[PDB]
Amino acid sequence: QISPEGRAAMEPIVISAKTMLESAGGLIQTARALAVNPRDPPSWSVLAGHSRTVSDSIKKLITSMRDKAPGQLECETAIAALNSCLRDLDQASLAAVSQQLAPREGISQEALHTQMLTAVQEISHLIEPLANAARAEASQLGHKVSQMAQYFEPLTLAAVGAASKTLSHPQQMALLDQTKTLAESALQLLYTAKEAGGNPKQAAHTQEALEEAVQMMTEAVEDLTTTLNEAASAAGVVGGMVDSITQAINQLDEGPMGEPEGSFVDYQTTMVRTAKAIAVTVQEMVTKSNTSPEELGPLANQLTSDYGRLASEAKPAAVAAENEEIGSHIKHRVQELGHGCAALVTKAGALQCSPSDAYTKKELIECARRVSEKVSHVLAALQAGNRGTQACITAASAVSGIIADLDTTIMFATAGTLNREGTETFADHREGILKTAKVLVEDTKVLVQNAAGSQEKLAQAAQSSVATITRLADVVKLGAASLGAEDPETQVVLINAVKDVAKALGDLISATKAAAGKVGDDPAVWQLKNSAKVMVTNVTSLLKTVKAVEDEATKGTRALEATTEHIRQELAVFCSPEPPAKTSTPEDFIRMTKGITMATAKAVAAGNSCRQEDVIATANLSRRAIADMLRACKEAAYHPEVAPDVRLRALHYGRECANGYLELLDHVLLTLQKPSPELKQQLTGHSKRVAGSVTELIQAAEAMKGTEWVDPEDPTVIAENELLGAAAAIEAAAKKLEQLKPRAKPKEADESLNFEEQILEAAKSIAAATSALVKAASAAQRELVAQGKVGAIPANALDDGQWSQGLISAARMVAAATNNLCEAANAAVQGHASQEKLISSAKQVAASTAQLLVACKVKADQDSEAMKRLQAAGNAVKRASDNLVKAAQKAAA
Amino acid sequence: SVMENSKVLGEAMTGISQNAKNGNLPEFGDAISTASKALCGFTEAAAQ
Amino acid sequence: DPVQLNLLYVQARDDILNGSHPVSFDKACEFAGFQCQIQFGPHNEQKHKAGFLDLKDFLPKEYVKQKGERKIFQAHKNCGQMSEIEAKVRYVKLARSLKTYGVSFFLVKEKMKGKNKLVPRLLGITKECVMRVDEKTKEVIQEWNLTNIKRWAASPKSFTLDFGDYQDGYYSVQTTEGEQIAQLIAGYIDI
Amino acid sequence: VLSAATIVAKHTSALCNSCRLASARTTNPTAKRQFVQSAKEVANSTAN
Structure with missing residues (x-):
């Protein structure tokens, strides 16, 4: 479509352009007479006048392109649009922090949240084409800022209404900050687009x-996204999120x-x-269906x-496939799960309002069972394809x-x-x-x-x-328990x-991950022959580890070779x-760094x-x-608060x-x-040379600390309160099964048998043991604060505070695992239809x-007064868990 | 593209004129054909 | 006076050690060199070696992890044969040279302009002007006259400053003591 | 023969370049499937 307004604006450009041809029309025909007659006195007067009519049209046409300014005037109006909306955010921050602005009782919160979403x-949707259309078309720059700047003026008007009637004062001010962050990000986007000009x-x-x-x-995308839909997930509102399924559907219909x-x-x-994550997520909501329907808010969100x-991952799947018949067979299966999940969320949202x-x-049960059979079809076509x-x-x-199974066995x-x-x-x-x-x-x-192949x-x-x-790992546990606890x-x-070996076996399959039916001349497929050769030296070390334990003269000699x-x-x-x-955290690295000082006392005295x-x-x-020290030297190095020049200093040390x-x-x-x-005696001399590198690793950890404090809180204080706090929580979890x-x-009841x-x-014997195990753990740390074995000095507080943080965590992770098992035992009687979950x-x-x-x-003994009660009740937990493990193999198979 | 032909045709204002002062007719005639081609790209740019 | 200026040096050194008086890293190293010049007289390079003393009495806990005491010992080479009273005079003069002296300072957490990130800053209030100070460089970022600032508002968690049309945008921070800040602002009733 | 054939074989690659811009921008997968064999049959005609 053509506009007459810009047609009148572009019309003086054609004035100097057409008259340039008029000055060029009479020029050559007068130059044609100059080819016949070289010397004529009136001819050189009108030839300079011909070139002057050219040059006067030259100077006007050249400056008209610079006086065009495409997209320059329209972005200046967007500046006043941003200056107006920021002043709206200014006075709204003044009134809401004083709670003086009267809200609108007619308008609603979730109606306003649907508009702002x-x-x-x-x-x-406009930002990703805006970056491409910035450098490409300068007239599109003023075109898009007319669309963009008109959006924020009612969006700020929609923001101040919901924030006025917002009850939570930290929530009523956090929405203003991200909109301020969204406005300044577009303001710097306005600064970059105007200065570049495409x-x-x-x-x-x-x-x-x-x-x-x-x-x-893009920072302003996810900040404004997650703050509002989770506020909508706080209620039972299913709107926009159900449309987000359709907003994932229409991009698939784009092809x-x-x-x-x-x-x-x-x-x-x-x-x-x-696809494996969403199947257990909705199966988790089966457990939360009858028990706690209020938790289902952010789950579907x-x-x-x-x-x-x-949908975004499945978007380039059809083109990357060799056959378009197989690739189009995938994309409709996504919308089949999209149709089922859309009915899953809007029925639960009404169930959120009606608990x-x-x-x-029961209506939510079958459609969850429908998409479980439908998600089997989205992978069977992947099973039909040889690729992948x-x-x-x-x-x-x-x-x-199995590594996590061996994680239980290394802690046995x-x-x-x-x-x-x-x-x-x-x-x-x-x-x-x-x-x-x-x-x-x-x-x-x-x-x-x-x-x-x-x-x-x-x-x-x-x-x-x-x-x-x-x-192999089952007979490893048969051999490890055969040695005895002595x-x-x-x-x-x-x-x-x-x-x-299993860690080398896990890296061995990763070589075949990038090499599926492919040639072997690549060095990664030579690494498939090399990491297996590493595994060959490990599986023959496994031959040697059997030879290490069975004798005593070369017992630690052959063990140290592996x-x-x-x-x-x-x-x-x-x-x-x-x-x-x-x-x-670098404080966890400090705990591993100071542990080498105690490890050097063990290493030298063993050889002596x-x-x-x-x-x-x-x-x-x-x-x-x-093992974990080089992991803590790598994970804490790439922290954003850690300076990037000091991390390679710690990597060198x-x-x-x-x-x-x-x-x-x-x-x-x-x-x-x-x-x-x-x-x-040389082991004593070599111990300080490692300790010299430890002290440089300490000073590298001193200069990497991005946190303002060397420790977050006092270690012995919060470890003591969370100990007895989780002690009643397991007792609260123990009475849940009796409830x-x-x-x-x-x-x-999906299953009502006698198992x-x-x-x-078995769950009550877990609950009765862990109620007494946590009281054996309550007397454990109480002896640690009475006898004083872990220490209380501030220098070793960085060595024990990570342990004190883990003492809070592992008591609460026990309190979480006994909560999730009671969550599993709640789903066990009603029938969870999932063997691997139990x-x-x-x-x-x-x-x-x-x-x-x-x-x-850690920093304690195995035969204390409370540790022996931790031993007997801890063995009662494992014998009740393993009886529950073999019962879970038959549960809902 | 305007700044290319601005110096070409600006020289051709003196290029086709000085050859006619000397009577250099093959030099003037080739300067016209270059100036005409420079005006071809000038008009095709200005129309765009 | 060699006694009253010494007492002011002790007060400034204690305010350094608790951290109420903010200083940069080089100024902290120079003040630690001056403190060692007071506590140990003139500097001898053979006496001061590696692992001599802990920096908790010379620096706060946010400066003991810098690994710069040898630099402070390099500042010991900047000391030389300086006397005690001249070290006190240079301590008080370098303390009064920085703008942080005698100014009500508060450590705050602010939101970055454009970036959704929390950054610590310092707010320095006088009877006539307020200033924003960088955490790392200890540099006065921006100043604001009391007459140009229109209003101020506090919360149990945050604080804001309304400047009117004199300055585009307000000033928002997360202050747990902004009520005392507003009380001190209302204490500046002298117009 | 040989100089003009290089101009023709230049433009056949421009048609293969045009089909790649067409097939990446086509909503219809049927014509996109025809766009694959379009530049293919250009190469089947040109290389012969």
């Missing part, structure tokens, strides 16, 4: 200021946007994990935001739980709960570890043979690899041998710069005693310390402290080779139990 959604001649330093303003607006930069196998792995992540209603609960390491995603999630011996079970000895179970290892090398050998032999070798280690240190080196072998696997990727996802059992007690203490300790680990090998005391009546109602009575007596709830309640027993035994 839709306002930002139309804003956010000029490709202008340099890229303005373009980096544009992309900074892109992330400034393939373009060719993706990532691989088809990369986005397939991101889909199957997010979390599922609302995750479905937008699901006493039970028919909507779908078995490897199920492999890595399984062996992480350190707490001392792993007693000798019957007549089991090391000679009885040494071959079952190795006979499984004989098939393990053959499973490792065919992994590089299945590097190129079909998906059927690849997924069969992937599933048999998980079946190998699960057969010598716990050889139990630790037995499990940690196969634990680092200890130094494991550190070089860790130090290879530690020297490689890898930003971790987890953020660790020349006892191979004390070397294993050193090698278990050295490997456990050096952390590398050479491990290099100074590995040489110390090489010299205590010579102490096992040579019993001369002259080699023992739960048997499900006489046929509607809520629910076996679960309930397995995971009974395993984590034993995992937190050994975690708190480890957190209690």
